[PDB]
C-alpha cells in the first residue's frame, strides 16, 4: 500500500512534469516494478551468489525489505535461510563480486 501511495503521487508528478513518461507509459506493473528500489543484487538472489559464486534472478514476487531496499530470492528456501541471518549476506565492506 506504501508502494501504491508512492506510485500514485508519482503518477501525478509524471503528469505534471514530463512527456517522456508518456513514452515510458506502457505497462502499469512494469513501471511500478522498475521504480522499486532493490537490494545490492537488484535483480538477483544474493545467497546463491555467496554460496555458489553464481548469478541468478531472484523471484520477483518474493518480497523482503531491508535497509530501505527490497530483495528477491532464487527460491523460497533461499528466502527462509536468508531471513534467519540477512546481515551475513550483505556487501558489508566492498562491492559485490
Amino acid at each position: 500500500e506504501e508502494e501504491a501511495e508512492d506510485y500514485q503521487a508519482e503518477t501525478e508528478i509524471d503528469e505534471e512534469q514530463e512527456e517522456e513518461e508518456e513514452e515510458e507509459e506502457e505497462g502499469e506493473e512494469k513501471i511500478k516494478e522498475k521504480r522499486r528500489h532493490m537490494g545490492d543484487t537488484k535483480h538477483f538472489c544474493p545467497v546463491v551468489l555467496k554460496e555458489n559464486f553464481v548469478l541468478q534472478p531472484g523471484n520477483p514476487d518474493e518480497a523482503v525489505k531491508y535497509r530501505e531496499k527490497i530483495y528477491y530470492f532464487s527460491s523460497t528456501e533461499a528466502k527462509e535461510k536468508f531471513l534467519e541471518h540477512p546481515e551475513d549476506y550483505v556487501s558489508q565492506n566492498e562491492p559485490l563480486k
Partner: protein, 502 residues
C-alpha cells in the same frame, strides 16, 4: 546574518545573555542581580561566559561562527588575550572572513542608523528617514518598467502610493520613537573607528597572516548583505564542507496522539510523517523503538513518537522531553564508540549448575559483565539480616518483659521466660515485615558495585553488567521485582525432552 545563512550554531553575546536569562540560570541570577542593582555587566564577565559557551558540548558538536570577540578590550584587557584564547581553542576557525570598507563610507552607514525607542528595534535610514524612502520612490518612478504595460504601472504606482503614505504615517509615529545614540554621533563613531583601526587592525593583520589565505574570505561592506550571503554559500561550496546534521522534531504538525501503538505500525507512520518526497521515507536507526540515551546509560527504554526525532536521515525515539533536549544537545558521544550496545541484566533458570554457572561465566566474559551468585552473595546477607531481625526482637522482648514484670524480676523468672519464649516463637513464625523488600535492597546493593565496575571498563557505561543464578522462585516475590522495577534485561529457561535422562 551569516549564521542565519548557515543555520549552524554560533557565538553571539546577546544570545548568551538571553540563554542565561531564559534557562533560569544561577549565573543568570547573577546577571539579573547586576542589572537590577543598576550595575553594568562586565565585559570580562561576558568574555568568560562566551568562553564557557564555546566550551559547551552542543557547540563542540555543531561548531560555531564567531565575531563577538575581539572587541575594544585594550582600554582594559589586552585585545591579545582574546586572540590568545582563540588560538588556545581546540576549534580555531577553519573558515575565516572579513569585510573591508572605506572609513568614511562605514561612518556614513553609521549615520544611517536610528533606533525605535519603545520596541528598542534598530532601523536603517531606508526605514527611518522618509526622505530616503521617497528618494527611492523617485528611483522606482524614474525607471520605466520594462516587461509591463502602463495599466500595471498605474496599478502598482497607486498601490505603492497607498503603501508609501501609510508607511509615512507609521514612520511619523516612529519619529516619536527615533533616536540617534550617543555613540552614533559622528565624533564618537570616528573615535571608535580610529581606535579599532590601530589596535584591532594591527592585531588582525597578524591573525590573517597566520591563516591559509585560500580559506580566508574577504568581503565588501558597501553592499547588499544578500550579495555577501550568497557569496559565502558559494565559497562554502568551493570549500566542500557541510553543515553539521541537525535533529528534526517529529511530533505531529499540531497534534498530540496515541503513539502507544504497535512498534511496526508506529515506525511506518513516523517514517511517512513530515516526509519530503515519495520513496525517500526516513531510515530506521538500528535500535527500533529504543531510547538510545537510556541504553547508553544502560537502561532499556523505548520512546514516544512525540519524543521521536530523525537525524542523519535516521529515526530515533527517546523516553522523555528532557531526553529529547539532552540528545538535541549532542548526539555524538552516545552514538560514538563503543557504539550503542547492550549491558547485561539477566537471570537463568533450571536445575543446578550443569554448565549453567559456566554459561553465565562465558556470557559475562563476552560482555565483561559480572555474575551474582544469589546463593553465595545474596543468601548469607539475607540470612544475617533475618538474624538481625531476630536478635532485635529478642532484645526488645527481653527489655519489655523485664520492665513490665519488674513493674527484682529477672530473665530467670518463669512468666518472663514463658512470655519471651512464646513471643520469640511467634517471631520465628513471622518474619521481617516484608522480607523480599530486603532481598531487592541487597540486589540493589550488589548492583551498585557492578555499576562502578562497568564504569571502570573501557566502554564505561553507567549500568552494571549483572547476572543472578540461584534466585529462589516465589511468585509474589517476583511481583515485588516489578514494584521496584529492578528487572533484568533478559531471562532464559532450561528444558529438555529427555536430558531428564541424558
Amino acid at each position: 546574518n551569516i549564521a542565519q545563512a548557515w543555520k549552524c550554531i554560533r557565538v553571539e553575546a546577546l544570545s548568551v545573555l538571553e540563554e542565561h536569562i531564559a534557562a533560569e540560570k544561577e549565573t543568570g541570577a547573577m546577571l539579573q542581580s547586576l542589572l537590577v542593582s543598576g550595575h553594568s555587566i562586565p565585559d570580562e564577565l561576558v568574555t568568560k561566559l562566551i568562553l564557557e559557551k564555546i566550551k559547551s558540548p552542543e557547540v563542540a558538536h555543531f561548531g560555531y561562527i564567531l565575531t563577538e570577540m575581539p572587541s575594544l578590550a585594550q582600554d582594559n584587557m589586552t585585545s591579545l588575550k582574546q586572540i590568545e584564547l582563540v588560538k588556545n581553542l581546540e576549534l580555531q576557525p577553519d573558515i575565516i572572513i572579513n569585510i573591508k570598507c572605506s572609513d568614511y563610507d562605514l561612518c556614513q552607514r553609521t549615520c544611517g542608523q536610528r533606533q525605535h525607542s519603545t520596541t528598542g528595534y534598530v532601523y536603517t535610514r531606508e526605514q527611518w528617514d522618509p526622505e530616503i524612502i521617497e528618494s527611492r520612490r523617485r528611483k522606482k518612478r524614474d525607471f520605466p518598467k520594462e516587461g509591463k504595460s502602463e495599466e500595471e504601472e498605474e496599478e502598482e504606482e497607486q498601490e505603492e502610493e497607498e503603501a508609501f503614505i501609510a508607511e509615512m504615517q507609521m514612520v511619523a509615529e516612529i519619529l516619536q520613537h527615533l533616536v540617534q545614540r550617543p555613540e552614533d554621533y559622528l565624533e564618537n563613531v570616528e573615535i571608535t573607528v580610529k581606535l579599532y583601526k590601530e589596535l584591532l587592525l594591527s592585531a588582525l593583520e597578524e591573525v590573517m597572516a597566520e591563516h591559509n589565505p585560500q580559506y580566508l574570505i574577504e568581503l565588501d561592506g558597501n553592499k547588499s548583505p544578500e550579495e555577501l550571503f550568497m557569496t559565502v554559500i558559494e565559497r562554502l561550496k568551493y570549500l566542500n564542507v557541510r553543515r553539521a546534521a541537525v535533529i528534526t522534531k517529529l511530533q505531529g504538525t499540531e497534534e498530540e496522539m496515541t503513539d502507544i501503538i504497535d512498534t511496526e505500525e508506529l515506525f511506518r507512520t513516523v517514517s511517512s510523517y513530515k516526509l519530503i518526497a515519495p520513496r525517500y521515507r526516513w531510515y530506521r536507526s538500528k535500535w527500533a523503538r529504543s531510547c538510545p540515551v537510556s541504553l547508553k546509560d544502560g537502561n532499556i527504554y523505548s520512546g514516544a513518537a512525540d519524543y521521536t526525532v530523525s537525524f542523519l536521515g535516521k529515526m530515533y525515539c527517546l523516553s522523555s522531553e528532557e531526553t529529547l533536549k539532552l540528545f538535541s544537545l549532542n548526539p555524538r558521544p552516545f552514538l560514538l564508540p563503543p557504539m550503542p550496545l547492550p549491558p547485561c541484566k539477566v537471570f537463568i533458570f533450571g536445575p543446578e549448575h550443569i554448565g549453567k554457572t559456566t554459561l553465565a561465566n562465558l556470557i559475562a566474559e563476552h560482555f565483561k559483565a559480572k555474575v551474582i551468585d544469589y546463593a553465595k552473595l545474596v543468601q548469607p546477607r539475607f540470612d544475617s539480616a533475618r538474624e538481625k531481625l531476630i536478635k532485635d526482637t529478642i532484645t526488645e522482648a527481653t527489655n519489655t518483659a523485664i520492665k513490665v514484670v519488674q513493674q527484682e524480676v529477672t530473665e530467670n523468672h518463669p512468666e518472663v521466660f514463658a512470655i519471651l519464649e512464646d513471643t520469640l516463637r511467634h517471631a520465628k513464625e513471622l518474619n521481617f515485615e516484608q522480607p523480599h523488600d530486603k532481598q531487592a535492597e541487597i540486589l540493589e546493593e550488589v548492583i551498585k558495585e557492578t555499576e562502578d565496575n562497568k564504569n571502570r571498563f573501557p566502554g564505561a557505561p553507567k549500568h552494571g553488567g549483572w547476572i543472578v543464578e540461584n534466585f529462589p522462585l516465589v511468585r509474589e516475590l517476583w511481583l515485588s521485582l516489578i514494584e521496584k522495577a529492578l528487572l533484568p534485561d533478559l531471562v532464559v529457561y532450561l528444558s529438555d525432552a529427555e536430558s531428564n535422562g541424558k
